[model samples]
Target chain A: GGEHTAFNQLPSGKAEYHGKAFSSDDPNGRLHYSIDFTKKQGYGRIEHLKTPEQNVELASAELKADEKSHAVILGDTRYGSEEKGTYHLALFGDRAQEIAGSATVKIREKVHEIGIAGKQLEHHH
Target chain B: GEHTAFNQLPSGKAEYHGKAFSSDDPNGRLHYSIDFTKKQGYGRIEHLKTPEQNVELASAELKADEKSHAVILGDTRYGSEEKGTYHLALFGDRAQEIAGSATVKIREKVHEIGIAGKQ
Candidate 1:
C-alpha cells in the first residue's frame, strides 16, 4: 500500500477466459436484431428481442404474423474519425415483388460501437 | 413590347387566369402524390397515379392484383439560401395491419418554392 509508481492492470484484465481476447485490429462483425416497436426517438426503444441476431440473418421476416413487430439493427461497427462513415438503410418490401412500394433511407450517425485491444469505444467522427 | 428589357418569371412560369395566382406564399403546400409507375429514371415516367398523395396518407395497400405503380410529388416549397432545414419521410404500409412493414426515410431535397419573402 505504500509503494507508488507501479502500473497495475485493471480487474478482469488478467483473466484468461479460455478464449483469446479481442485485439484492436480484430474485426467484430456488426450484429442485426429484431425489435417489436418503433424505435424510440433516441434508439431507446428496443423491446423484448423477438429474434436473435442469428435468427434474423437467416430468416427473411418475423414469423409471429399478427402480433410480432420487426426491426433491423446493426452494432459493433468500426470506422475512422475522419472518414464520416455513413449508414444507408433501404427498406425493401418483398424483393420479388414489383417496385411500386420501395423506399430508401440514408443517415450520418457518425459514431459506432467497436471493440479494440479488449476495450470498447465509440468510433468517432 | 419589343426592344424593351423586361424580366419575366419565364414560360412554364408566368400566367394569369380567372382564378387567383399562387402567391409567392399562397400557402400552396408541397403536395404528396401517389405515382403508380414507381418514378422514372430521375422522373420521366409515372404510371397512372394510383391515388393522390392524399389517398395513401388516408388508406392502406394499393388495389392491384399484381400490376401497379406509385410515386409522390411536391413542387411548391420555399426556402432560404441558408438554414440547413431538412425533410423526413416515413414509409408506412398497412398501418392498421402491423408495425413490421413500416420504414422511415430522411432526405435533403433542399429547396422549396413559394412567392418569396424572396431569399
Candidate 2:
C-alpha cells in the first residue's frame, strides 16, 4: 500500500459541527449546540430551545490530540459565579466532520444533564 | 475525560434495541449504518411485539468523545423542544454500542426515547 493515503483520521484544519441535546431530568428542556475546532483550541455555544435567556457560550477552549483522542476541551467560561458548565467533545469522521459529547450545566442551582450530537456544517482544510 | 480510544467503526450495518420514552414506552429495535468516512448516518425504529407503526429516526451522525472513550451520535433527537428540532448520538466501544436519547414529533407530539443496542 505504498503511496496510498492513511485511513481513519480526523481533520487537522478548523471545522464546525451542529447538533441537539436533551436533558434527562426535564422533558421541557432541550438545547442546540455548535462547536468549532481551531488550530489549537475549540469554541462552542449551547442555546436553550425553550428559554433563550439560558444560553452558554464559550469564547474558546483547549484542543488536544493524542492520536487516538482528538477533542476540544471546554473547561471554563463563567456566566457569573453561580453558573457554569464544562463541555468535553470529540471529533468524529475520517475527515473530522462531527462533534458530539455531553455536559452538565447549572443555572441558579438547577442542573441539566445533556447528551450532545451533531455533524459538520463547515470545514477548512 | 478518559476518551483514550478511537473507533475504526468497521464500516457496515448493525441492529440496535432500546426503550421508547414516548407514550406506552414500548421496547424498540433499530437498524443503523456505520461508516467512518461519512460524516452523516441514519436509522429506523420499531416496537417489539407491537402493531404500532415503526418510527424511523430522521437523524444520524457520528462523533468521538475521546475523553469519555465514547463516540457522539451527531444527530440524536432532543426532548422538550419548544418548536423545531435537532439531533445527536453517542457511540461506545469501537462504535458498537449507544443509548443516545432521541426526540422527535410523533403524531404531532414530541416523543423522546433511547434507541440503544450493540453490534
Candidate 3:
C-alpha cells in the first residue's frame, strides 16, 4: 500500500496531490482518483479531468461563487487495492448565508485510506 | 488591435470538434440555436440544422504566389433590431499564416456605429 497528500486553496483556486503507487505487483495496475467539493446534506461538484492512472504530476480545480460557501473533499482510490486516501476540506465561502449546522466530506467504499491534506487559505486582499 | 488567446478557437484539423452559439436571432434570446459542423472525411462535409443552420452564404477561392486559399462565410441576425454577427473560416496551407482561431466574428455595421456613439 502507498500513501499521498492533496492540497487546495480558494480565490487563487488550486489543487494538487503527491503520493506513491498503491501496488507495483501488477504492471497494469491503475488508480482512479477524484477531487470534490461537497456539503453535509449530500450535494457537491467533482473537479479535475479524471485520473484513470497513477502518474499525475499535479492537477487543479476552480470554484466560482458570487455568494455562498463550499465544503471541499479531496481523495483517491482504486479497485483490488486495499488502500485509499482522504482529506477534510476547508470552508471556501464568503460567509454570505446564515450557514446553519455544518459541512463535511464523507468517504465511501475504501475512500478513507487515501490521505489528502490541504486547506483553502484566507484571501489577503 | 490584433488580439490573441492560447486556445481561443480550434484549428482546421480540430474544427469539426467545435461548436458555436449566438444570441443574434429573431427572438433576440439565447438558446434558440446552436451551430456545429463536422468533417465527414477528407474533402467531405456534414452540416447540422434544427438547433441552428450552417447556412453558407458565400465562398471564395483565391491564389497568390501559386498557392490556393479558400474562405467560407455566413452571418447571424438579432431579429428586427437588425443587429448581427458575421462568421468566417479558413482552410488550406495558407491558413497557417493567419496564426489564430479559425472562426472570426465580425459585428454588424449598425452595432459598431452604435457603440462608437455615431449611430
Candidate 4:
C-alpha cells in the first residue's frame, strides 16, 4: 500500500502547479496548472515566452485518473476544434513533489504538443 | 543595471538537471560556468536517453540580464532552416536552476524542445 500525500490527494483537494512547458509544434512557454481535486476540474494555461502575463487557456479539462499508477488525465478527444489532444499526467518523486504531464493542445487553432513538469505550490488542503 | 541577486552567484560552475521535451528525447544535463571576471558566461546541454544519444549541443554564450539579474543565453548558431537558436532562462537563488526553450537542428530535422533543471 502506498502511503503518501500524493496518493492521498488522488481523492480530493486543491493544488496549483507551476513549471516549464515544452512544445515542439508551437511556441514554448510556462505552464500554469490549477486543479480542484474534489470537484474533479482543471484549468490550465501556457503563458507565452518571457511574458507570463499573457496566456492561452485550456477551455475544458475532463479529469480522470487511474488509482494504481497515480496517473491523472485531463482531456479526451483530439477530434474537436476546441481541444487538440488529451493530457496524460502522473505525480512524481517520493513525496509527490511534482506533477509531470504531456498534452497536445490548440491555441489559435495551432497544434502544440506540450509536456510539463511542475512543482506543487504549497498544500491547500 | 544588474540586480544584487546576481552577486549571490559564485564565480564558478552552476549545474542543473531536468526534463526536456524534444522531437525524440526528454532528458538532458546542463553545464554552466559563470565568470564574473570576464563578465560573460558559457553553457551547453548533452542530450540523454536519445535515439542519437549524448549529442552535445552547441555551446551558448551567457550575459548579464539587465532586469532579471540573471544570465541569458544568446543566439550564436543562427544559420539555416535547420539553423535553430537556443534560448535559456536562469532561475532560483544564486542560479540554482535553468529553463530552456530552444530549437536545435539534429541531423535532418529541426528539434524544438523545452528543458528545465536545478542544481
Top candidate (lDDT): 4
lDDT of 3 by residue, A23-111 (tens): 11112212222233331211122222233332222222232221122333322222234222211222322321011111111124111
Error of 2 at B95 (Å): 30
Q: Which stretches of model 2 miss by more than 4 angstroms? A: A1-8, A25-38, A52-54, A66-74, A80-83, B1-119
Give candidate 2's error at residue B3 in angstroms.
Answer: 19
Better of 3 and 4 by TM-score: 4
Give me candidate 2's TM-score against the actual structure.
0.43
Runs in model 4 deviating more than 4 A are: A1-12, A25-28, A49-55, A60-63, A76-81, A93-95, A106-111, B1-119
lDDT tens per residue, model 1, B50-87: 11111111212222111121211112111212211111
Ranking of models by lDDT:
4, 2, 3, 1
**Cα lDDT tens digits for candidate 3, B6-98:** 223233332222222211211111111112133111111113222223322222222111112232212233221212222222222223211
Highest DockQ: give the candidate number: 4
* Residue pairs with backbone atoms closer than 3 Å in model 3 (clashes): A84-A113, A84-A114, A85-A113, A85-A114, A85-A115, A86-A114
Clashing pairs in 4: none
- lDDT for each candidate structure: 0.16, 0.46, 0.20, 0.50
Q: Compose the digit string of candidate 1's lDDT tens values, residues A1-125.
A: 11111112111111111111111122222223222222211011111222221111111222121111211222111122122111111111221000001011112421111111111111111
Q: What is the TM-score of candidate 3?
A: 0.16
TM-score of each: 0.15, 0.43, 0.16, 0.42
Candidate rank order under DockQ? 4, 2, 1, 3
In model 1, the Cα lDDT at residue A17 comes to 10
Off by over 4 Å in 1: A1-54, A58-125, B1-97, B107-119
Better structure of 3 and 4 per lDDT: 4
